[PDB]
Design a protein around this ligand. Structure first.
Ligand code: 5WH
Ligand code: 5WE
Length: 255
């Protein structure tokens, strides 16, 4: 992997952050100074060299609102993934911590951060396919970034549009739909979407035009933006560039 190969001698482990999806994650330092997150890949859990297409993705895709890969430790097992350290951890847990007493300006900033990452991915013709608050991380400054980008019952039924559930029709518009659901997760302070329903019931209600209600903290203008991601006809949903312009407009008007 050329310049992406990190010498494991340069890593120092400081704390186990937890068991994320895929393996153990630890907070550590690179060459004793730079903060990093170190993910140990679980043995055989995932798969082969051919799956290290995800590394080809992470080594080529880069944005300020995407969790940045710093390098990998592959000349040894278990494999280490070295990434940007996100001090506030998972966005979903961050939203659920009632001690933050979030203002709606902060919630809209979280949407904007994710929308920027997604506009970038849209521009690179990349499909996240599992966009949700559980796959977003928060740094020490409260900046949200998208992680696990195109990694890849457990299917994300509640973040999927009708055409994905009925026909497996994945497109940039199914990422748009998931983003509206992620804005709803943010404005509901991390509620499970369709929390009264099972996945099978959500899929039937979604096929029948049910839509997530406006969270109390979302204004009618913010709700219009998330609702525009859920047009039954995929071609009627906006692009991330349009969503970003809409969020910027609401921030200028409300903020
Ligand atoms: C979930 C729990 C426990 C774990 C916590 C956690 N995971 C990551 C983290 C997230 C993703 C990756 C990563 O390597 N991603 C990846 C890897 C590939 C692959 F290598 F396969 F190509 C492809 C795509 N994406 C590496 C990471 F260190 C990070 C991170 N960078 N910083 C801080 C915390 N982090 C989040 N949580 C919490 O904060 C909860 C609240 C306590
Ligand atoms: C000054 N300091 C941070 C560097 C000195 C600290 C340092 O070397 N560190 C700190 C953690 C492990 C190690 C490390 N970091 C990187 C890296 C790569 C890309 C970007 C980036 O921003 N890329 C972008 N691409 C497009 C837009 S932005 C930022 C960092 C890399 C790398 N590619 N191979 C090996 C080791 N690497």
């Amino acid at each position: 992997y050329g310049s992406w190969e990190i010498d494991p001698k340069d890593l120092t482990f400081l704390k186990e952050l937890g068991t994320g999806q895929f393996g153990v994650v630890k907070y550590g330092k690179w060459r004793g100074q730079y903060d990093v997150a170190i993910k140990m890949i679980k043995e055989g859990s995932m798969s082969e060299d051919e799956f290290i297409e995800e590394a080809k993705v992470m080594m080529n895709l880069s944005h300020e609102k995407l969790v940045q890969l710093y390098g990998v430790c592959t000349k040894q097992r278990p494999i280490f993934i070295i990434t940007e350290y996100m001090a506030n951890g998972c966005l979903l847990n961050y939203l659920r911590e009632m001690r933050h007493r979030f203002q709606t300006q902060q919630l809209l900033e979280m949407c904007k951060d994710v929308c920027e990452a997604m506009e970038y991915l849209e521009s690179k013709q990349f499909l996240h396919r599992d966009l949700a608050a559980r796959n977003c991380l928060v740094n020490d400054q409260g900046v949200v970034k998208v992680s696990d980008f195109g990694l890849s019952s457990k299917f994300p039924v509640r973040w999927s549009p009708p055409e994905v559930l009925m026909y497996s029709k994945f497109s940039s518009k199914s990422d748009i739909w998931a983003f509206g659901v992620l804005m709803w997760e943010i404005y509901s302070l991390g509620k499970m979407p369709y929390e009264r329903f099972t996945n099978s019931e959500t899929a039937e209600h979604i096929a029948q035009g049910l839509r997530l209600y406006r969270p109390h903290l979302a204004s009618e203008k913010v709700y219009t933006i998330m609702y525009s991601c859920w047009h039954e006809k995929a071609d009627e949903r906006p692009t991330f560039k349009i969503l970003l312009s809409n969020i910027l407009d609401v921030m200028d008007e409300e903020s």
